[PDB]
C-alpha cells in the first residue's frame, strides 16, 4: 500500500539551504545542547529545569505546549513523570511527530549524563523548531491539515531491570491517554479524504523517534516495512547531501552511509512500542549497533562526535522540510 501523503522531492534550492551549516547555526545548536548535558534523573531538580527549558523554548516560538504529568508506581516507589508535547498547529488533523526521551538513566555506578541517550536528540528537536521557525510559521497558515508535533517523553528508562512494567512510563501513559481520547475528522482541520480518525492517536501520521544519537558513524536500517516510503526519503536526502558535498567528512572523497538501504533483524524496545501496538507508523532513528558508550558513565559530552551531529542535523532539517514542503 502506498503512503497516504504524496511525498514531493525537495527542490535543489531547498536541499542546498537545509544542507548549509553556518557558524551561528553551530553555535546555536551547541548553546541548546549545553542545557541538556546535565544529569536528568526522574523527579530531580535538574530534570525539572530541563523540562522548563523545553517548555519555555517552544512557547517562545508560539507553539502549543502541553505538560502531561502523572504519578506512576516503579520498583523505586511512586514517581512523578511529565511528558512534554509541543504542537505547531493544534487544529491540523495530521501530525508529523518527532520524538525522544528527556529523562536520564539512574546509573548504579554514579553520575550519568546520557549525552547520546538522549541529550543530543532533545537538542536536535529544539534546534529543528528554532532553525526552521520562519518556515514552520509560514506552513501553519496553509490550512493543509498537516503540522509538526514534538514529544519529549519522560520515564523511558528502567529504574531496575528493563521489563514491560519497568520502562517506557511516559510513552505507555501518553499512548493510552491519546487512544482513549475520542475524536473524528468532522472535528478537525483538513483530514486526508480516506482517513480513519476515531481518537487522538490516529492523528499521529508517523512517529519518527530519535534515540542514541551523537556518536560517530551510526548505522540505521528500516525497522518497519510499513514506513519504508518515509525511511527511503532519509536515504535519498543523505545521498543528495553527499552528492552536493555538504557532509562533513575527515578526508576528501568520502561519503556518509548512515541510512542503510536495507532492513535488519533487530528488535529494539523504546518509546515507540506503545504507539506501534496502537497502529501508529514508526520510523525508529536509533543506531544498530548501539554506541559503545551505551549505558556507561562514558556517555558524556566529550565522547560526542560533532561532525556527525552536524551531518544528522542537515538530514533532519531537509527531511522535515521535504515532508512539510517548507
Ligand atoms: K535562497
Ligand atoms: K537508555
From Swiss-Prot:
Main location: secreted
Disulfide cysteine pairs (residue numbers): 69-82, 93-191, 100-122
The protein's Enzyme Commission number: 2.3.2.5
Glycosylation sites: 30, 261
Stated induction or repression of this protein's expression: Strongly up-regulated in salivary gland during blood-feeding on the host. Peak expression is detected 48 hours after feeding begins.
Record's subcellular location: Secreted
Any single biological process term in GO: peptidyl-pyroglutamic acid biosynthetic process, using glutaminyl-peptide cyclotransferase
EC category: transferase
Alphabetized UniProt keyword annotations: Acyltransferase, Disulfide bond, Glycoprotein, Metal-binding, Secreted, Signal, Transferase, Zinc
Annotated consequence of substituting residue 117 to A: Significantly impairs catalytic activity
Membrane-spanning parts: none
Domain of life: Eukaryota
Mechanisms controlling activity: Strongly inhibited by PBD150, 1-benzylimidazole and N-omega-acetylhistamine, in a Zn(2+)-independent manner.
Reactions catalysed according to its record: N-terminal L-glutaminyl-[peptide] = N-terminal 5-oxo-L-prolyl-[peptide] + NH4(+)
InterPro entries per the UniProt record, alphabetical: M28_QC, Peptidase_M28, QC/QCL
UniProt keyword Glycoprotein present: yes
GO function terms (MF aspect): glutaminyl-peptide cyclotransferase activity; zinc ion binding
Record-stated family: Belongs to the glutaminyl-peptide cyclotransferase family.
Annotated protein name in UniProt: Glutaminyl-peptide cyclotransferase
Gene for this chain: Qptc
Amino acid at each position: 500500500l502506498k503512503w497516504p501523503r504524496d511525498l514531493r522531492p525537495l527542490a535543489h534550492h531547498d536541499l542546498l539551504y537545509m544542507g548549509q551549516i553556518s557558524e551561528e547555526d553551530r553555535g546555536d545548536f551547541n548553546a541548546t545542547l549545553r542545557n541538556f548535558l546535565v544529569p536528568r534523573v526522574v523527579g530531580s531538580q535538574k530534570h525539572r529545569e530541563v523540562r522548563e527549558f523545553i517548555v519555555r523554548s517552544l512557547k517562545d516560538l508560539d507553539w502549543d505546549v502541553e505538560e502531561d504529568c502523572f504519578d506512576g508506581q516503579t520498583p523505586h516507589g511512586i514517581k512523578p513523570f511529565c511528558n512534554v508535547i509541543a504542537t505547531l498547529n493544534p487544529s491540523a488533523c495530521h501530525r508529523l511527530v518527532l520524538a525522544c526521551h528527556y529523562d536520564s538513566l539512574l546509573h548504579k555506578e554514579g553520575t550519568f549524563i546520557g549525552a547520546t541517550d538522549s541529550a543530543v536528540p532533545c537538542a536536535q528537536l529544539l534546534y529543528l523548531a528554532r532553525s526552521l521557525n520562519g518556515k514552520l510559521q509560514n506552513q501553519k497558515t496553509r490550512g493543509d491539515g498537516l503540522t509538526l508535533q514534538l514529544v519529549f517523553f519522560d520515564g523511558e528508562e528502567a529504574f531496575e531491570r528493563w521489563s514491560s512494567h519497568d520502562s517506557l512510563y511516559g510513552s505507555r501513559h501518553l499512548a493510552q491517554k491519546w487512544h482513549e481520547d475520542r475524536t473524528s475528522a468532522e472535528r478537525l482541520e483538513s483530514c486526508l479524504e480516506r482517513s480513519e480518525i476515531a481518537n487522538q492517536i490516529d492523528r499521529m501520521e508517523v512517529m519518527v523517534l530519535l534515540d542514541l544519537l551523537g556518536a560517530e558513524n551510526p548505522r540505521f536500517y528500516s525497522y518497519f516495512g510499513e514506513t519504508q516510503p518515509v525511511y527511503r526519503r532519509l536515504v535519498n536526502i543523505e545521498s543528495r547531501l553527499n552528492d552536493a558535498g555538504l557532509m562533513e567528512l575527515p578526508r576528501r572523497r568520502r561519503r556518509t552511509n548512515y541510512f542503510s538501504n536495507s532492513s535488519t533483524v533487530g528488535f529494539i524496545e523504546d518509546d515507540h512500542i506503545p504507539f506501534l501496538k496502537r497502529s501508529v507508523p514508526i520510523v525508529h532513528i536509533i543506531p544498530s549497533p548501539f554506541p559503545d558508550v551505551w549505558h556507561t558513565l562514558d556517555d558524556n559530552e566529550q565522547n560526542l562526535h560533532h561532525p556527525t551531529i552536524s551531518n544528522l542535523n542537515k538530514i533532519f532539517k531537509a527531511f522535515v522540510s521535504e515532508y512539510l514542503q517548507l
